[PDB]
Symmetry: D2
């Protein structure tokens, strides 16, 4: 029970990787705020409660500062000081560089990059006064480039930059800020693809299988623990050796 008596916000935790992260944190004893724009977040929180954990859904669009301020206020009123923030919420609006619309650019930056910043900021305001904390950002293997992902790669590389900046500003205050880059993970987004394509992606992964949400969760749980106090500003790939 490595995270007993700790409070964690996981953004985008209604489903997929976020939900897997929330399960693992809950398994290790954390009180978990499921922060999501979608109301299925209530079902995710309920699922954690049914397994014996303490959990609460808070509706939040991370791209809106006032909603993010409200998320942190409410979270702390309910479960006390936020020890752990996991910035997992994100979207794709893929297109080739020459075709990408301004709207599809704007929206991906707004959620993945700005939204992540807004949450990091709220965590930082609080954590720097308490002298403790964990911020863990979910980036992507696409941060060093991927076809069709000018907006997404920009946003996720941006997240890595902020991660490293925040490490420098907050490390002396007892806070760690790290990034995880999932490789190819089995979720709803990756499942709905022709089976021939799936096999091509698998053949790019030296380990020979797609990861699960819980593989990302295990790495988050480790970075969130006291044993990872000296890991700061890192980018850890969770992709079975896969070089995108």
């Amino acid at each position: 029970m490595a995270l007993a008596s700790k409070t964690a916000i996981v953004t985008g935790a209604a489903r997929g990787i976020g939900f897997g992260i929330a399960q693992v944190l809950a398994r290790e004893g954390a009180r978990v705020i499921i922060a999501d724009r979608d109301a299925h977040g209530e079902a995710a929180a309920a699922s954690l409660r049914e397994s014996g954990a303490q959990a609460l859904f808070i509706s939040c669009n991370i791209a809106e500062k006032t909603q993010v301020e409200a998320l942190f206020s409410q979270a702390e009123e309910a479960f006390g000081p936020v020890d752990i923030l996991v910035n997992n919420a994100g979207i794709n609006r893929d297109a080739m560089l020459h075709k990408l619309t301004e709207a599809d650019w704007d929206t991906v930056i707004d959620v993945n990059l700005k939204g992540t910043f807004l949450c990091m900021q709220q965590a930082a305001i609080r954590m720097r006064e308490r002298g403790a904390g964990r911020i863990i950002n979910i980036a992507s293997a696409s941060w060093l480039g991927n076809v069709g992902q000018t907006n997404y790669s920009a946003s996720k590389a941006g997240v890595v930059g902020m991660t490293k900046t925040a490490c420098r500003e907050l490390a002396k205050k007892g806070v760690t800020v790290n990034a995880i880059c999932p490789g190819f993970i089995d979720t709803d987004m990756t499942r709905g693809v022709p089976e021939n394509v799936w096999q091509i992606m698998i053949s790019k992964i030296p380990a020979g299988y797609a990861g699960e949400a819980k593989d990302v969760g295990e790495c988050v749980a480790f970075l969130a623990s006291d044993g990872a106090r000296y890991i700061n500003g890192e980018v850890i790939n969770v992709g079975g050796g896969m070089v995108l």
Copy 2:
């Protein structure tokens, strides 16, 4: 005369690194569009003309798609197909993570990241049809983190991500896309800093001095030449060995 009969757009070329880049490109025979939001860009273009080069100022705010579309239209009407794009325009609005205003976040992302995207997009639309081209993005040593630069580091890491994405999309079309990360360069932006700070930055540079605009220019000119056809998706530091 490595760039004879080539047309280059250099954004942010009214002063500083951009102007140095434009000088070197002009020295190697390029026709140079000085693209800048500031009207001093006319004086910069005039200075190149007085030295014997062909040059033209076009007023442009790279954050506005319609102005960027106009920049490329006019550039091509005047000097023919754009062979080389140098995305140098950028700004700082520094602040610690816990203090950074939403406006200061927005503006830096809008210029450095989105602006760079808009220009890359216009270049890509054209260059992929011609089967030739050079895109060179000026990032920063701050892309892997720097105190006070949550917004700036996000934006510049983002530029690195897009650079690598564009390399993957465009390399087979005979186009290279690379990034230069200047370290500490002597310009108007770095000169207007307390003298105590300047000395701290100098002591971080193994070479023992601040670089000049022309040092960045020389690297741009090399990447722009036919001899660098096989360099693609690279991040080259021009910082006298400086590890930020």
Copy 3:
């Protein structure tokens, strides 16, 4: 008890980081072989036994293939199949590039690089047949350069290269191979340094203090567990955010 019923070899585990790693692995239930060239390794093993763990010292100079073959034979006779190898043993013989003697070059490469290879090889021979395993190499922040460390940086960068190579060869066989780069850790090697130097290294560490052996140990224990099955070929810095 994440490593119950697992057998681990930790090279260089008589003292310092190696001994800390061995403690943490033992705490999580592993049977630990203390492999070291120094006979104080018997005391380290005894200390683990006195705390309730199973542990055995085996004398070994990792630079000698025949001794490494003997280490693995004996280890397996005593505690059964080796599930985990931690290549921690290493030395410094620092000197500026222009002064470094051939003997001091030879010895550092022989231990840090070749020794690590020999042990990796023995682990690989066995692990690839069993379809399971963990190899964790202790590299150094010096792998991307450090004054006075031509031989050491060469050796540790070399270790990173082998780590990534081995990930590619072994991942499909259910084995992970990862590297940890400690930053500045408080051990016998770092304590025996002029006090003026110590203070300079501390001022480079954003966290504000030198790490302990157990900080490296916690990261090893995580990578050795089933929860890190999808982390492969990584280089994880354990240095309180320190950029050397």
Copy 4:
């Protein structure tokens, strides 16, 4: 004529990449020492002389300190102070990690890593007193791992480590030390492979073709010039965007 009145040693310049580098340096006006263990080096030097350049073959096995000392003595007696050292000489003795013989390990480290060190050392002794110089090391895309190349990847990552170390020690003395990582280059070593295999390797290169020796040469020539004085400790890939 960017390198007029400069003296360059290129190791391994009897054929392949080394010979291409020597051609480009000679084209830009350098006096070139072809340093090689093979006597075909005399023919390579003769070929440069027939094109109008000044060139000299010196027999040298870079793994032997006394021969390297002799190489630098003779080179300077013939063509005056060595301004540029290109450490290109290297070998492969590939094998899987579990099969690699001790002899094949030893020989690759001895040539690629130790040999490169010995030459760097001789250059450094001289260049640090003169207050000027260029060292350019040919590494490989394999430095971040490649199947069957435990020894080669170790050796080439090692070269990158030394490169960065030497940058830190020598930058303040007006010397730059950089590394080039060729991707997939058309030489005698790469030509002797079944044509079906070659096409698979080509399809992994975003640029869509294999590089030539002269592509590496162009990058060396640039780094060797005065225009690259502010590039130091860099690893530049010359591989058409190819991520190994």
